Design a protein around this ligand. Structure first.
Ligand SMILES: Nc1ncnc2c1ncn2[C@@H]1O[C@H](COP(=O)(O)OP(=O)(O)O)[C@@H](O)[C@H]1O
Ligand code: BEF
Ligand SMILES: [Mg+2]
Length: 311
């Protein structure tokens, strides 16, 4: 999967924004409240509307002072270019239109009936929503979501790997993710933790950290460490699936991280994020600029986001 273009009109702080995304690490940098997460959440809305996420509401996200919201996304999947266009009219919903086209030769052609339901039906077959929310797009505040429970983790894993012996394949997959996560987390914590153990056990995927030679529960970690671990696991997952999904969208990776950890993050960008064909990384941390392949600066001007292509 590859994101080419996002166009947003009257979505939260964005009055009129166009962002071109490219291969490699695409860093979107800007201060608190400038419009970074609004762009990512516009991508989510663009792909999967109707959503049932409590903090994203049609009547809230229309930019104050405007009536019409417009989201347009161009992306590639499995060699085919796709375009989804959504127009929202606040307070109303019948006069609003949703279309999904594909590039067939030169002409763009509707892939289905231009309706939320049919598009959702197609999108779920193209890229399942759970894979997007759990494996592709890590929303702000959700870095540690994968540390939540053995069951939820089993659910995401099972969904992510899809369909001798299924169990052997599962063990091998989890083993590889565990290897990768261990390498990353050990780099992140300077050998404080020598392994991240990801283990299948009944309808559950256990997750432990090794400290002084023994497996420990996740409560063992400090807050910053849980951030590091979440990053490590999601990166391991993205790398394991690098050939299949090839995209990682990560909002603010720096919460609770001290100075050294923030420096290690750069090393991790350099060593690992560069192995994922496309990454969209959002942060207020300027230190992250040098390790990125493409930098987009966002700021708030007179009530509206302004986007500036740096590189
Ligand atoms: N409906 C709206 N109309 C105009 N501005 C909005 C609306 N909803 C939210 N905002 C503004 O959008 C700003 C950017 O939010 P966000 O993109 O979440 O910031 P960040 O760059 O920190 O992710 C907020 O600080 C808020 O003032
Ligand atoms: F306040 Be933002 F998410 F940088
Ligand atoms: Mg944000």
């Amino acid at each position: 999967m590859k994101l080419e273009r996002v166009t947003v009109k009257n979505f939260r702080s964005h009055s009129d924004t166009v962002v071109e995304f490219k291969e490699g690490i695409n860093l979107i940098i800007g201060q608190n409240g400038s419009g970074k997460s609004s762009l990512l959440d516009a991508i989510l809305v663009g792909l999967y509307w109707p959503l049932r996420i409590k903090d994203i509401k049609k009547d809230e996200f229309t930019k104050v002072g405007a009536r019409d919201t417009y989201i347009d996304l161009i992306f590639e999947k499995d060699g085919t270019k796709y375009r989804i266009t959504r127009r929202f009219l606040k307070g109303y919903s019948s006069g609003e239109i949703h279309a999904m086209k594909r590039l067939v030769g030169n002409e763009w052609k509707h892939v289905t009936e231009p309706s939320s339901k049919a598009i959702s039906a197609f999108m779920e077959k193209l890229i399942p929503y759970n894979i997007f929310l759990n494996a592709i797009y890590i929303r702000q505040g959700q870095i540690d979501a994968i540390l939540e429970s053995d069951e939820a983790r089993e659910k995401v894993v099972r969904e992510v790997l899809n369909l001798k012996y299924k169990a052997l394949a599962r063990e091998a997959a989890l083993s590889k993710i565990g290897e990768l996560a261990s390498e990353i987390f050990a780099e992140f914590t300077e050998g404080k933790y020598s392994e991240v153990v990801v283990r299948a056990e009944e309808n559950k995927v256990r997750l432990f950290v090794v400290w002084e030679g023994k497996e420990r529960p996740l409560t063992f970690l400090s807050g910053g460490e849980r951030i590091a671990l979440g990053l490590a696991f999601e990166l391991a997952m993205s790398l394991y699936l690098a050939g299949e999904i090839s995209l990682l969208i990560l909002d603010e990776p720096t919460p609770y991280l001290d100075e050294e950890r923030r420096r290690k993050l750069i090393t991790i960008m350099e060593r690992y994020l560069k192995k994922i064909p496309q990454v969209i990384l959002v942060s207020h941390d300027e230190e992250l600029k040098d390790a990125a392949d493409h930098v987009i600066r966002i700021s708030l001007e007179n009530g509206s986001s302004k986007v500036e292509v740096v590189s």
